[PDB]
Amino acid sequence: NYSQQQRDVWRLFKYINQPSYYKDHVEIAHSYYFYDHASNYAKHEVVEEFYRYFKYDTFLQRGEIFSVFHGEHLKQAIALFKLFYYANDFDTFYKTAVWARQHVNEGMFLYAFSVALIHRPDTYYFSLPPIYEIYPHYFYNYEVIQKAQHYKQMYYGQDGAHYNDRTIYANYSGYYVNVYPEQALAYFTEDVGVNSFYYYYNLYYPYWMSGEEFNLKYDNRGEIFYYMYQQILARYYLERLSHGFGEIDHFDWEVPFESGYYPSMCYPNGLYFPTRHAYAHLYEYFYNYGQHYGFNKYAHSYTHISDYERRIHDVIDSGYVHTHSGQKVDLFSHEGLDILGNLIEGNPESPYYHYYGAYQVFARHLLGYSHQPLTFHKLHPSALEHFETSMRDPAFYQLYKKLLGFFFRYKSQHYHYYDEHDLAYHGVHVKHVEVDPLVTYFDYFYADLSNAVYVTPEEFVHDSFKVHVAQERLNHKPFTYKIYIDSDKDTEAVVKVFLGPKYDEYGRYINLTENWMNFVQFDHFVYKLKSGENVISRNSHEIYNYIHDRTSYYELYQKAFGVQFHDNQFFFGFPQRYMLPRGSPEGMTYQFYVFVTKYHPYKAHASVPMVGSGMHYVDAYPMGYPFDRPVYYEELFYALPNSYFQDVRIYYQG
Amino acid sequence: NYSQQQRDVWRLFKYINQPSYYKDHVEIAHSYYFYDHASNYAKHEVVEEFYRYFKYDTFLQRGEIFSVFHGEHLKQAIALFKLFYYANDFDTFYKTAVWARQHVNEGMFLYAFSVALIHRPDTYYFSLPPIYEIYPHYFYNYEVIQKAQHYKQMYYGQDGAHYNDRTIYANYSGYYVNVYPEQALAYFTEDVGVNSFYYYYNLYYPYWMSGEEFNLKYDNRGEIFYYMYQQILARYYLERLSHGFGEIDHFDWEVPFESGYYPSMCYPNGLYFPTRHAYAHLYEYFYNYGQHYGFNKYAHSYTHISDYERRIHDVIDSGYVHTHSGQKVDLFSHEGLDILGNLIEGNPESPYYHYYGAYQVFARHLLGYSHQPLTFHKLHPSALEHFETSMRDPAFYQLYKKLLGFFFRYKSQHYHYYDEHDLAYHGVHVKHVEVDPLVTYFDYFYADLSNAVYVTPEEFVHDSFKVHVAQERLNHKPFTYKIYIDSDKDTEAVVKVFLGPKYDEYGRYINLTENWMNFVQFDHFVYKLKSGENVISRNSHEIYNYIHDRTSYYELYQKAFGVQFHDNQFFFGFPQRYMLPRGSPEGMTYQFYVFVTKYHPYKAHASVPMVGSGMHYVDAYPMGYPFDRPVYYEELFYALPNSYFQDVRIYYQG
């Protein structure tokens, strides 16, 4: 049944670094042969491609590091995902998944299987075990994995109820070593929930998936790319303001990269993560000094980065894009932001991928600053080269701020600033907003770390060994804010609440003209107004639209994890405990912007909740609609009756 | 008995990272109290000092990294060594050793115990288990330790004769990552035998031990410092010539350090070794960027290095040393090289330690290029900051070449070049030298790696788990060289054979004037000549005087390890398999210099073989006597009848 399919899906993720020792899994893997049948998949091309990869010494063996930002790794993972996705029936998909689990590389199998599960018509609504639990090596410092393995080695017969079911109290990166100050925001950048958010966003909309083939173009994906990255940057800026940090550092490709990253994580094969030192020179000569290369295109990541940056600048200035036809494509269309997002991201929907390329891929390779692989099968990728650990690197935020500057330039040059009438909602007036005291504190979070040790077959079958990891994760006391609206008739409005800063780290007031980009979508719902006075009450545990529209969320929770506050993986999901940025004992001061507008339903492609169905969104206004473009008159945003600015102090206790 | 004492000493070194689970060890540690007795040690000051360190929160707890190049680590290790050494009877020493094993930090205990054992009157002749087996984390890449721990976790009841007694085939540093080319000589720099040699040399003559208190001044220690480091540098240069490398890179403190080091080792607490990146800036600002410091003197290692280098330059130029009396001390005495060695090294015999200081300590701290410790108990030292891993870093060789340049300057300015009469041995003529074909090849070396995993008490007591590591170590086919001498009367001569290069990496002939420093002491023995023709036959397995005089060696082998080719630890010990530098299939060409001189017995302080007894040496000539100073006429060294130059090709096969 659906419950049994869910349980089997979860079973498939146990002890990924080891072969599946379940009897059914072993039998299925040893007896099944995808190429032998070759008829149960909707397409024979996908199976033929995967067979070509698998047989003729062009496949990533078990035990090798997998990176989705390496070309051949990506090609093989795509082939496996297509094999999983084009299974005519779920039974064939399960047999293929079991075989791949037992035979295909661990990281490659995990990525292909996850993308298939979120994207398959049948298994879209399947919950997935938290990634930080499945593959913990990417989420905890090696001082935690090594301690878990200490307990595992010591747990043998003697000393019962000792070295078992033990809680490892992990610290964040800067506890032991005095790492670079930017890594002081380690409890946020290295939070398992935030990295899970980024990883699940990339699972939902992979940078290599084509919107024509996989229906991701009905979700725009360019506006998604832009809005998701801008919201991540804005939430990071809010956290930095909380901790007294300033705006994210600006960096030049031609100046030594002033920031260094010292990861504390380790690969399951005993290989430590690459380290980027302070003031690292990013030039071909310096970042390939003392290396072989010769036929590695990533060795020249600097020249490719400069080329793609130049091309993006040119297309944004002109507003005219080059296509394979070499013709003139208008970028001023209604969906010009979408075209720009596809162009910059590098997804198969890019106007000309050969010309604009994957700027982010080469930027991550260069800023990761690790040795170029001697061979395909001997690769040493950095944090920036994985989705699960990208947010841990400050260079991640600096790189994507450099990217979003391009979108800001496009909007500034080609978008007309909103006037009073465009934002006006005649007959609606937000009288005042009451928000309960916003308090943020730290609490311990317990996660099943047992997947980081090597279990014996009996232990595997019975899960006898248990080892937890406890981590201080920011949490907030539940709050409920009220919105009072005085309408003129029974209209159907859309309410959009934003969270942004009012004062910078130096206490200076930030004008909306230089502050529109720092606003974080706090809630985005639809309310049916009535003539006269209305009161809108919203709880903290009812907000599912943080920095992202998730309208069909919680119906998947009520089914999969609804058989509380359990890692969803449904849509993207920002941690409910990280919604409010850390405050101060005195209370760092932010402001909430409340907006109300008439309903504009989105062009939903289909009713079924699914990636690419278009059912995600609330309204058809541009994402972050009031602040999606530069603001030329702050007093205009203050004077709108259907708007309201309200100031709150978030209090940190601990 | 002596055998039982040896077995107990070896037992003390099992599973150092874990508490000793032997019943006797636990009983002794829990019942014994060194401060409680306080009378069994020759001095109450040492016990009082160690008690002060141990009780009042100024002691290094178990599980913390220990570095002998940190001031407070060194002070505590010295206190513990003095506690071990001043045990009036061996029984008290054993009780103290057991207690420290069970209670004192692992690295600190290991260092203090080893130094005491080599330096104690009673236990000088005790063999010690190989350091690369006792504390393998400093000798193998973490890809080996993690694999051993994989096997340990998997070895539980099921799968017998599987994951036990397994051989791990380890590779050298550049196998996986394309590390900097200087790390291509990894099979030599990272050889367990060579690093054991350096570590045992530093155990025998620690940089902090006073020659007055511990009789190390009867071994000069300054000439030892110089000659040992010069011979290490020369052997490294021979290896570099074998592999086509050139002279060791010269570096300026004021220019970015062009070489980078990427260690693959990991600390037992799951912390990866520090990495030095290519072209690392060594200035205060750059190597402390983004760090706290504030009361760390090592934070200003650059200024201290410059100061001490300036002082050393000044004293070598003047030949006049500053003392606490501030008076003029002649450096031109017979033992002026000894004074210079004590001055540069920084041992308590230094003429004024406050003024000249420990140049090597700060140089290692700076070139290690790691984060300065946030606290005494949270330290992250580099390879250069341990004796067991110093030779793995190319910066080690560059640093000590920079040091030995000072001694070269002293000798060039203040020593008169030898004439024909000084080197003459009238009546002696080396007719010709025959050396068997010198062949070097690789073979697997098996070492007990079981000490890198965590065993249960029953496994500890029975040593049930066994895991070996196999490594390709250079070995040479046994050879026997003949020396023909035509004497005039029955004299007693000293034979000194040197190994040095004839052609550089570019095929150019090296003149003795620029080649005297590159000669490696191959053998140094005494033969009783007879009137007329003599023939001297020496086997390869009878040479114990490689780059170091060990006359009282092999009598300790015949007793301790003599109850073959087992890691000695007696005196220093260069690996017998690394005596001949790797050749080439065509055969890299070197030359042997054979010298004969009349006997000059050394001023032996005592007959008993022991560190500081002066019994090490063969003759009283200056170490490397023919080549201890610059050569102003190579033809002079060729024309001496009692000398002979012979060319050999060493053939590499494999």
Residue numbers in the entry:
A (entry chain A), B (entry chain A): 25 to 587, 595 to 685
In the authors' words:
Here, we show that coating the cryo-EM grid surface with ssDNA, or other negatively charged polyelectrolytes, reduced sample aggregation and improved the distribution of macromolecules in holey carbon grids for cryo-EM. The samples used for testing, hexamerin, human 80S ribosome and apoferritin, exhibited undesirable properties such as protein aggregation and/or affinity for the carbon support on standard cryo-EM grids. The use of polyelectrolyte-coated grids was essential for the determination of macromolecular structures from these samples.
Hexamerin is a 57 kDa protein from the haemolymph of insect larvae and pupae. Purified T. castaneum hexamerin at a concentration of 5 mg ml−1 in pH 7.5 buffer containing 30 mM HEPES and 100 mM KCl was used in the experiments. The auto-picking procedure, as implemented in crYOLO, efficiently identified the hexamerin particles. The final structure reached a resolution of 3.1 Å and the surface regions of the cryo-EM map of the hexamer were of sufficient quality to enable model building. The mean shortest distances between automatically boxed particles of hexamerin, which has a diameter of 13 nm, in electron micrographs recorded on standard and ssDNA-coated grids were 16 ± 2 and 40 ± 13 nm, respectively.
